[PDB]
Amino acid sequence: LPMLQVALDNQTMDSAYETTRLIAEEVDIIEVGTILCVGEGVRAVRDLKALYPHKIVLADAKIADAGKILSRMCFEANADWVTVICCADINTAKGALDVAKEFNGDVQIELTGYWTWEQAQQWRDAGIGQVVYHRSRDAQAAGVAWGEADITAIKRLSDMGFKVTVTGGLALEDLPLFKGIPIHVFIAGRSIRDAASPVEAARQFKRSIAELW
Amino acid sequence: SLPMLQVALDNQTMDSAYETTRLIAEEVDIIEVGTILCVGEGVRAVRDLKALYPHKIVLADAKIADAGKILSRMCFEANADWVTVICCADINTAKGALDVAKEFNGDVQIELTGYWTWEQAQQWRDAGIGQVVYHRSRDAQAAGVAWGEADITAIKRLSDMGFKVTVTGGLALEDLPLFKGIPIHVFIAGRSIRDAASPVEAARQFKRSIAELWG
Ligand SMILES: O=C(O)[C@@H](O)[C@@H](O)[C@H](O)[C@@H](O)COP(=O)(O)O
Ligand SMILES: O=C(O)[C@@H](O)[C@@H](O)[C@H](O)[C@@H](O)COP(=O)(O)O
Ligand SMILES: [Mg+2]
Ligand SMILES: [Mg+2]
């Protein structure tokens, strides 16, 4: 089944803990959001992995250059997975992946904003096995909906051999759009953290995934 | 005008950054909180460095990719003067960051990398972005990529479009003459200053060379 990831896009650790104390056991992956990496730094990764060592911890660092250096910082803080932004030089992705392998971790390419199909082939050739198909929050706020072009791109990525994560303002009602595609992970940030009942929100995502897959 | 000099604090902790700033804060124009310091310490790095050096321009090299208003507000509330937005970001991310920047009398720069296009560059101008950072990736440099002709052409074209262009990416002193005759806004040095036997003398050599080349 597709896994469920919660995004902790919080500015401070104590704010993040308001969510994790409710739903850490209701999800498969705990993400240190980019917002939390910028708010608190990499201690957020170390602290969350110490609290939840049985969960996959994703550092959404969106590494853009100095791949081996930033990745080592994240993996020394006990991250399992780290993100590399799609426009990074290929050598950045390669360097981050080399370090990830030292720590028995992994790298995901974050498809946030503009990228090309040629770049996608380069990632595959480099040994990258995960991508995050992300509808930008700012694009969403400007009225951009999930649509057919996204579904065709996701399927194309999956067919290239990537394990694809889908994310970007997902609501429970969006999940059927992706039915029949072997999605690796769905991420929910706002729709879990900001729900009247975060526990019910997480359980509803899991129930719907179980029904659809 | 002479190109200004920016020091990049690509350090993992504040104390490591301070080993540099205590030597060269008054030897450079702009103090950059490097991306790895932003990720290493978080936005306290911006707050602390601006409190130490309130008369200097402080740049947060956050390379914002999405959530432009949220991340830019975090940096500007920490008293940044300038923030970076990565070139692949949705145009609404750049616009959101810029709108916040204006509230704080700050500014945004687009960090150039990847396969950005000239049409995107026009989008940034149309959105009111006035600064770009022409950056040779550190990882590309390590893979043998040199500064060269296509870079000069692109830098000149960005300048002609109306951007103030910053040049950066493993610059050494000997690289500066490559850019002579172009109205470069800022040169950034990270490693060439921080890792010098004498960071003060390295900064001063950059300044002397700039003064000759653009004098
Ligand atoms: O770009 C960012 O850093 C976040 O907007 C993004 O990574 C976020 O973590 C999403 O992937 C999930 O959060 P939402 O479900 O609230 O969009
Ligand atoms: O991508 C990064 O975060 C840095 O590699 C980059 O921004 C760096 O700060 C350079 O602009 C200046 O540092 P060097 O002179 O050491 O390349
Ligand atoms: Mg995220
Ligand atoms: Mg930098």
Side-chain angles (χ1 to χ4, degrees), chain B residues 8 10 32 34-35 61 63:
Chain B
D10 291 307
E32 158 184 343
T35 313
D61 193 4
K63 294 177 173 70

Side-chain angles (χ1 to χ4, degrees), chain A residues 65-66, chain B residues 8 10 32 35 61 63 135 138 168-171 188-191 194:
Chain A
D65 189 25
Chain B
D10 291 307
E32 158 184 343
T35 313
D61 193 4
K63 294 177 173 70
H135 176 218
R138 175 172 184 158
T168 187
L171 290 171
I188 309 176
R191 285 165 284 168
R194 301 199 312 279

